[PDB]
């Protein structure tokens, strides 16, 4: 049971109590992901319009 790094100021204080010692995707890659899904949407919609035109 020890207290360490006790810091006191006007608005409070803080300290540490120890009981026992121990024993990314680039901007380009994000544009591709976004554009890939946009493309898949464009494909599905064209398949709908192709179906409707038939």
């Amino acid at each position: 049971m020890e207290v360490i790094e006790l810091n006191k100021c006007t608005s409070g204080q803080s300290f540490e109590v120890i009981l026992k010692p121990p024993s990314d995707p680039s901007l380009e890659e994000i544009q591709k992901k976004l554009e890939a899904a946009e493309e898949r949407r464009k494909y599905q919609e064209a398949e709908l319009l192709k179906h409707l035109a038939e």
């Binding site: 049971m1 207290v3 790094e5 006790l6 810091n7 100021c9 006007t10 608005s11 409070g12 204080q13 803080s14 300290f15 540490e16 109590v17 120890i18 009981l19 026992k20 010692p21 121990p22 024993s23 990314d24 995707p25 680039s26 901007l27 994000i30 976004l34 554009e35 890939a36 899904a37 946009e38 493309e39 898949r40 949407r41 599905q44």
Partner: protein, 438 residues
């Protein structure tokens, strides 16, 4: 002084942001018009509260915040509510139609079209900062925007602000206050693509907030207002060290150092006390020991789980009110001889304690009663994995039938992203089990 930019995404993020910035103003003595008589430096200053508010020449203290929602109804309340005067219009971004509770719709379909605008607005706030620490991102797991657009925002933020810390406040889906059936899907999808981008995340289970409002506040059917005022108290307790003079958790960097030794396991459990009804004739003020002992009662946790059957990696006690180190260390000695606090052998068995003498502030007319001292314990427990296991299980039930998957594929998402996200969760659960169980 280093600045902190708050970001609120979706309905949950925006309504919780509203509740917090209301609480911040009451705490710093800021009025609805942005005026702060205590600030003797007009239109400038590098004080502690300046980490969250900038200043104009006219004395207006403007939150360093950005609200984003794909539909405008929730943000219009901000534009006309009590604190309309705090923000200028560029800080409130609203779209025309939301993500329909569809992750794919918010991340891909709509997110692709609005992402560059949001970053531009955030870039404006960054340009007012002399030393930006990082960001605080509030959002829900279940919403289409909260899950979908947030994970996109975190990806870009890591690209545009590589050396900046990002902390999350995430609302874990609870059926008692939701009508969306696909929320397990959204939650797991957003956790997967956000994991490598978030440095520390405080999950709040709506089921926990709900039951605390029924048990401790006598709210038979709590509303979002009831939930958000309680959630903003825990948020204030967590962010207080950034906004006031102190020495513990003085910058976003310190949250990871003190709470996250292993990067993927960055979901600390939060426990708050006391929550006392205001309608009570008059309550007996709880002692440092009693409220500290309450930090180990599952009933006061932001996520219902049993820490008795996990292992601790860190623990911080953030006190506010009439508290002195003499009383704190005393109650801790008594709680070790009674409680089941098992630490991991490669972490020091101890507690970091922060005390702020200003007791908790309560919104006038709110549900919470003024108390002389309160505490918030941030502990990193393997027990919180119970929440992933639950959420992951509901995912497995629907995905076994491919139920609702077509709505996501229809927005341009590949089905393999489901399984890729689920396999990531399976490994996250395994990380907790390898660190906690024997």
């Amino acid at each position: 002084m280093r600045e902190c930019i708050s970001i609120h995404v979706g309905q949950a993020g925006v309504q919780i942001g509203n509740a917090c910035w209301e609480l911040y103003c009451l705490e710093h003595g800021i009025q609805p018009d942005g005026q702060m008589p205590s600030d003797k430096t007009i239109g400038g200053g590098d004080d502690s509260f300046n980490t969250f508010f900038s200043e104009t020449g006219a004395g207006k203290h403007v939150p360093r915040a950005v609200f984003v929602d794909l539909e405008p109804t929730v943000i219009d309340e901000v534009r006309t509510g009590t604190y309309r005067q705090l923000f200028h219009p560029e800080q409130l971004i609203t779209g025309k139609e939301d993500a329909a509770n569809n992750y794919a719709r918010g991340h891909y379909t709509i997110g692709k079209e609005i992402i560059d605008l949001v970053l531009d607005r955030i870039r404006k706030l960054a340009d007012q900062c002399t030393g930006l620490q990082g960001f605080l991102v509030f959002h829900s797991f279940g919403g289409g925007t909260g899950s979908g657009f947030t994970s996109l925002l975190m990806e870009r933020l890591s690209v545009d602000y590589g050396k900046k810390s990002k902390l999350e406040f995430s609302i874990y889906p609870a059926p008692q206050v939701s009508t969306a059936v696909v929320e397990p899907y959204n939650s797991i999808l957003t956790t997967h693509t956000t994991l490598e981008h978030s440095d520390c995340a405080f999950m709040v289970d709506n089921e926990a907030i709900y039951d605390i409002c029924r048990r401790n506040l006598d709210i038979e059917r709590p509303t979002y207002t009831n939930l958000n005022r309680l959630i903003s108290q825990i948020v204030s307790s967590i962010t207080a060290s950034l906004r006031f003079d102190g020495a513990l958790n003085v910058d976003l960097t310190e949250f990871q150092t003190n709470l996250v030794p292993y990067p993927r396991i960055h979901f600390p459990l939060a426990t708050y006390a006391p929550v006392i009804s205001a309608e009570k004739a008059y309550h007996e003020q709880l002692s440092v020991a009693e409220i500290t002992n309450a930090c180990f009662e599952p009933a006061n946790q932001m996520v219902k789980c049993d820490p008795r059957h996990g292992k601790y990696m860190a623990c911080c006690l953030l006190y506010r009110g009439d508290v002195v180190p003499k009383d704190v260390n005393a109650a801790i000695a008594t709680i070790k001889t009674k409680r089941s606090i098992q630490f991991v052998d490669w972490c020091p068995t101890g507690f970091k304690v922060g005390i702020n003498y200003q007791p908790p502030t309560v919104v006038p007319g709110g549900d919470l009663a003024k108390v002389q001292r309160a505490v918030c314990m941030l502990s990193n427990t393997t027990a919180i994995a119970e929440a992933w296991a639950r959420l992951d299980h509901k995912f497995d039930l629907m995905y076994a039938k491919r139920a609702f998957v077509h709505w996501y594929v229809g927005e341009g998402m590949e089905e393999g992203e489901f399984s890729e996200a689920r396999e990531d969760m399976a490994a996250l659960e395994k990380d907790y089990e390898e660190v906690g169980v024997d």
